Structure formats: C-alpha cells, structure tokens
C-alpha cells in the first residue's frame, strides 16, 4: 500500500557530531544518531510533530535545511 511519513529527518551536517547535537537542541529534535552513506549524515526525531502522518512536513524540513550548518535535509517515510 502507501506509506506515511514519520517525525524523523535525515540531515547532512559537515560540521560533525557536536554540531548535530547542537542543531537538535536548537530546532527541537532528539538526535537519534548516524545514518546514511556518508560520515556526517544524522537522523533526528522531532519532539512535537506526530510520529506518523500522511502529511509531508515540508515546513519543518525547510527550517532544518535553512540552517547553514545543514546542507541537506529529508523527512523520512516509515519503513
Ligand atoms: Na498520527
Ligand atoms: Na543549509
Ligand atoms: Na528535503
């Protein structure tokens, strides 16, 4: 069938793991850890957005991507 989005975001943060934790705190996420195919790819879990929704939360992605420490960000679909 079709998949819903989860309240988790992947992001590329070249500044590294300390920056990842600082970004999470500032923008309202828990850091989940490292993912992806590159070293400085991190997964975040938003502290307030619903765990599961059909909504594509483009506005949260834009806030994350708009931080200059974050060069790329992507809301994740559920598995
Ligand atoms: Na929901
Ligand atoms: Na950015
Ligand atoms: Na994106």
Author numbering: 27 to 105
Task: Quote the authors verbatim.
Proprotein convertases (PCs), including furin and PC1/3 among nine mammalian homologues, mediate the maturation of numerous secreted substrates by proteolytic cleavage. The zymogens of the furin-like PCs share a multidomain architecture comprising an N-terminal pro-domain, a subtilisin-like catalytic domain, and a P-domain (also called HomoB-domain). Activation of furin is triggered by two sequential autocatalytic cleavages and subsequent release of the prodomain. In this work, we investigate the structural and functional basis of PC-activation to engineer prodomain-based PC-inhibitors.
M2 includes three Arg-Ala mutations to prepare a stable prodomain:furin complex. To verify the conformation of the secondary cleavage site loop, we solved the structure of isolated M2 at pH 8.3 and refined it to 1.3 Å resolution. Indeed, this region showed the same conformation in isolated and furin-bound M2. For the structure of isolated M2 only the positions of Cα, Cβ, and Cɣ of the side chain of Arg78 were build. Gln30 was modeled in two conformations. In the isolated structure of M2 and in the complex structure with furin, we found an unusual interaction of the His72 side chain with the amide nitrogen atoms of Asn74 and His75. The donor-hydrogen-acceptor angle towards Asn74 (169°) indicates a stronger contribution than the less optimal angle towards His72 (155°) as determined from the isolated M2 structure. The distances between the amide nitrogen atoms and Nδ of His72 are in both cases 3.1°Å. His72 can only act as a hydrogen bond acceptor in a deprotonated state. Thus, protonation of His72 at pH 6.0 will change a productive interaction to an unfavored contact, probably destabilizing the conformation of the secondary cleavage site loop.
